[PDB]
Amino acid sequence: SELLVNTKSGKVMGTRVPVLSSHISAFLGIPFAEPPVGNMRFRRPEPKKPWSGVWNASTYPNNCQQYVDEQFPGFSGSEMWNPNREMSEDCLYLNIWVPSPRPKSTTVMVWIYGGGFYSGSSTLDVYNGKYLAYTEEVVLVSLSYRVGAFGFLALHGSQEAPGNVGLLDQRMALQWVHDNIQFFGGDPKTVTIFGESAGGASVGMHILSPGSRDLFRRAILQSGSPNCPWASVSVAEGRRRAVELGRNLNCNLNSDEELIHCLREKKPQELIDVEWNVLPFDSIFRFSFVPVIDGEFFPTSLESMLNSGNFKKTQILLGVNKDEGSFFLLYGAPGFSKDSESKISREDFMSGVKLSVPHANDLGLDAVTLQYTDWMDDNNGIKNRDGLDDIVGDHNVICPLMHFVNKYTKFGNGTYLYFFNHRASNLVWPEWMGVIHGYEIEFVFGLPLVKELNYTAEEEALSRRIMHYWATFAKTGNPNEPHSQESKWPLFTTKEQKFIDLNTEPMKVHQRLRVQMCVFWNQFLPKLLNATA
Amino acid sequence: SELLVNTKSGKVMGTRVPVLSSHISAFLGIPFAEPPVGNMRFRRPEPKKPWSGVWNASTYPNNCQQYVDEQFPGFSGSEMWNPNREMSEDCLYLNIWVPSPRPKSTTVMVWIYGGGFYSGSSTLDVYNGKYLAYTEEVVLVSLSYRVGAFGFLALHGSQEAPGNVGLLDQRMALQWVHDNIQFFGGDPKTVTIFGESAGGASVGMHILSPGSRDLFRRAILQSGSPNCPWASVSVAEGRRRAVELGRNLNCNLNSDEELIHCLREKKPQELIDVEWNVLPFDSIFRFSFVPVIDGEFFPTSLESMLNSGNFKKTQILLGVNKDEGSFFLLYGAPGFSKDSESKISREDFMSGVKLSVPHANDLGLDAVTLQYTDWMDDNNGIKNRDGLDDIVGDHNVICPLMHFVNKYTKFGNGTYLYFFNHRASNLVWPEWMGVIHGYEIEFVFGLPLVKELNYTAEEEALSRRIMHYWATFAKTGNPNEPHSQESKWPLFTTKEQKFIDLNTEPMKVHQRLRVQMCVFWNQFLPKLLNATA
Ligand SMILES: CCc1c2c(nc3ccc(OC(=O)N4CCC(N5CCCCC5)CC4)cc13)-c1cc3c(c(=O)n1C2)COC(=O)[C@]3(O)CC
Ligand SMILES: CCc1c2c(nc3ccc(OC(=O)N4CCC(N5CCCCC5)CC4)cc13)-c1cc3c(c(=O)n1C2)COC(=O)[C@]3(O)CC
């Protein structure tokens, strides 16, 4: 009964599931913490009290309370990210995918979903771990964590709403995986945590946080970095938004205790409905309740931690996608559409620049504009559009990640940089959107392997290659074949700063990813805004 | 006796001179002002007292007291700009070149030599007007004006050293040409003033100055603009330098009167020897004593005058050369040589950036650096060198001229923009220096016509074309042939902003000359320096 597993918390009943004309085990819904309900809302997670009998882990668990995207109802493109289960605070569970026969001490891979820290679900179709676990014979785990106010409300000082609880949720799952994954054939001394966007930033935060370092071996970061403009706030801003939320809900503000009590009575949807109202600016790619630089989970400022090398030192595989910004412009910028090539005008361009760099003063905006405007042809609808895409991309994902890369590689043990630039043949979004943020995931989890998903043959190869790189890396700390003859994915070094692209064509090696624009975002603009303010 | 001319100041005896196996008249040394000597030093020029008898104008006059370049002794490249006559304060004379037979009421062209306002001579070989006057049958005139302290010392308030006297010198020559050029077959109602570098800036200043507008019809500007960073200073800076000069010469400073008396006793070389010591910065392309925004010669600030359209409205022909900055880097930047391809290092590059933009604060310097550095290959010796060339070029000549162009064309009557990018076949300077500042002059005056100067056949064509454009323009206000079939030199308009290049190849039309870099120099950087200071 490989489906009947006994863990240090209780027994769990699995379920056999088909995968590419075969089967593997699957334990969905394993609880790793007491339900963050009632007075637990906002508090740090508490480990799951051991249970009696057999816990049925055959179906997927609930999804955490979140904002649901309904801008394009009845459109797979955006609906594929929405909660596909019943939302509920009681949502701290994790899913495992064990190969069959159940191996022992095999590479473990824990996935942490993205979603800007305000949304996400471990139960999406696109995150079905059966293919990867099957094809690469690994123990694929998918955790979950609180999001929105629920997971990141921060009244620094209080013990009721300390902030970063959502990250602590991830830590406790990693801890569980630590103590129980061996009972599933997993090797706790060989765990790779990986995630995309907010999930990626999460991985990076676990690398930095002293209280998480010992819970994993190596890590992967997809289109996300711990130092991203949107991935965290100061204790002060965190407290400002928390109060604002309260004001937004007619609450006693006089003290933390009174405010916590008020927010703890409100139904989940009440909080969610006014969640966006706390942001300081009109903007895109900015999220209300995110990790807060607390001095605890994060010893000191992120930048200082990176300089001093105060962070876990291991191997990391990370990269980005060609058009990271397109997805956000569609949702927030003026002029963008899903039903047209969205040629942007000069006036809308100026508008998008503001929404994209909300914290910028007027001179800053000029800087950004000058940097991304071709004055030899500035009324070119196409150009302006691609210009915004790059701005949103470079500022929020690519350059922040590159800064992280360079900074990490000085103390790291092995850095692998990729540039995903393949436009899926069956993508439901229009063409101007290019290689959209988050669309490398379907290849990482190997959906191009499902013949019914009408992908191309060449795309099945890519997905198999990508999973192999991801699997091999988590297993060895290197994605390259021990000694194949296939082109090697070079090691990113401080001097050569090499990286490769990921697509159907033959591998190619490049250097200094968007180095020019990144000098602008990482060195210059920060200085300009500091001096002129 | 076409050589014997009677003017409203006295008679003058000319001299016949050979030109391309033929002859024309030439009156060298016509005095148009009382010698600015003794107590006249620094004062506004006074018209030349009518003389008795026949003034012999067969030889060239003296050159004004100036700093002599002796960085490359015995090298035609730099020596061709040095005074080729005996320097002396008594230097206010002008030269005329009248075709033979002496025509009547023909197009007149007055040349104003450049030299950063600290040097220059109307008697250089490269400025011999016999070819142009001969080939294009025009009355070519070459004036002179005081330079250095002598021509621009400015103690605003005083009447002894009011500043801008040097420009007034040019005005009085233009006035003379006005009242006497008809006696030489010239048409005072058809005078075109043209000059290069400081001379060009001069032309532009005459266009702006209310007291000069009526002295000419149309104008030409070569690699020089009235609004250039180096072409003028505020009344305050003007007074600061004047004092500094005095301090530099152990003078009573207590009052203008005492300081003027002191500077009026010192021999010309004394002043000249400490002339560079007054600049506020360590730098290249910056000159000690230049035009001062006085509220008189210049009603108000240059920028305001250009916005309000407060300036002479006529036709103008102007342009620049491909490598304006090279000449100055050779003389002031670290790393540059005449005996090598001057591949510049990253450290010397940073140094040159400072010398090139002396008025910039640290953030400004960063801006400039980021704008001209290719971070995909920043140790490329070549690139850095060309980068400096462009910086020095764009900041000091090209973008300032472009700003002038755009601003003028809103009220102008006809604007023609050229981009001289032909590298003379016999240039004595090394190749890296490209198309050096001031080397379009030899073609304007048509030296490629002299077979003994070993130019190419193709270069004789260019020189003849160029002179024709220059001549035809001064004659009609349009350089194009009334109705030839040759490619037309389009009119620069605010919308299309067209211009053409000048070289041996077939004409080509372009648009928005260095528009990208100019947005940086004309809009952004000025704003950045304003905000952050
Ligand atoms: C309509 C909901 C919605 C609102 C706001 N911002 C959004 C940003 C992004 C998305 O969608 C994605 O990001 N995407 C959805 C998520 C998707 N992921 C999914 C998982 C993997 C990566 C891709 C990418 C596209 C939806 C948003 C917002 C902002 C503000 C409001 C306000 O009422 N709203 C409502 C009031 O006042 C303010 O001052 C202001 O802060 C600023 C003006
Ligand atoms: C050696 C003389 C010389 C000096 C300085 N600057 C020069 C600039 C340019 C040339 O030559 C050309 O421009 N060129 C010569 C002129 C030529 N024209 C000719 C006509 C048509 C255009 C081309 C172009 C090349 C010669 C220079 C200078 C500067 C300063 C001194 C100081 O002692 N000097 C001496 C002290 O203290 C300061 O703080 C400082 O201001 C800044 C550090």
Ligand SMILES: *[C@@H]1O[C@H](CO)[C@@H](O)[C@H](O[C@H]2O[C@@H](C)[C@@H](O)[C@@H](O)[C@@H]2O)[C@H]1NC(C)=O
């Ligand atoms: C748990 O295992 C059960 C077999 O012992 C299986 O029948 C359950 O499937 C579904 O049953 C229905 C009645 C409902 O309870 C639904 O939630 C279950 O998914 C399976 N699921 C449970 C109850 O956890």
Ligand SMILES: *[C@@H]1O[C@H](CO)[C@@H](O)[C@H](O[C@H]2O[C@@H](C)[C@@H](O)[C@@H](O)[C@@H]2O)[C@H]1NC(C)=O
């Ligand atoms: C003025 O015309 C003279 C003929 O009447 C001619 O001889 C002069 O030539 C040069 O003569 C010598 C002696 C010397 O004065 C020199 O300066 C003259 O150039 C000519 N030049 C003058 C005197 O102005």
Ligand SMILES: *[C@H]1O[C@H](CO)[C@@H](O)[C@H](O[C@H]2O[C@@H](C)[C@@H](O)[C@@H](O)[C@@H]2O)[C@H]1NC(C)=O
């Ligand atoms: C390839 O699989 C697709 C899965 O999304 C499917 O939509 C395509 O359509 C066909 O299969 C099902 C889903 C149904 O729509 C049927 O009517 C279609 O034949 C499928 N490609 C095709 C056209 O065969």
Ligand SMILES: *[C@H]1O[C@H](CO)[C@@H](O)[C@H](O[C@H]2O[C@@H](C)[C@@H](O)[C@@H](O)[C@@H]2O)[C@H]1NC(C)=O
């Ligand atoms: C073409 O004219 C040049 C003018 O500068 C000259 O230097 C070249 O040299 C010859 O003429 C004179 C000047 C002298 O140097 C003589 O020895 C040379 O033959 C001249 N080109 C040549 C080489 O004929």
Ligand SMILES: *[C@@H]1O[C@H](CO)[C@@H](O)[C@H](O)[C@H]1NC(C)=O
């Ligand atoms: C990682 O560490 C091992 C041994 O500690 C060392 O041999 C290796 O060079 C390191 N990896 C890199 C390339 O940083």
Ligand SMILES: *[C@@H]1O[C@H](CO)[C@@H](O)[C@H](O)[C@H]1NC(C)=O
């Ligand atoms: C110059 O003025 C004339 C008449 O005043 C006018 O016809 C012409 O269009 C003007 N030139 C331009 C193109 O500005």
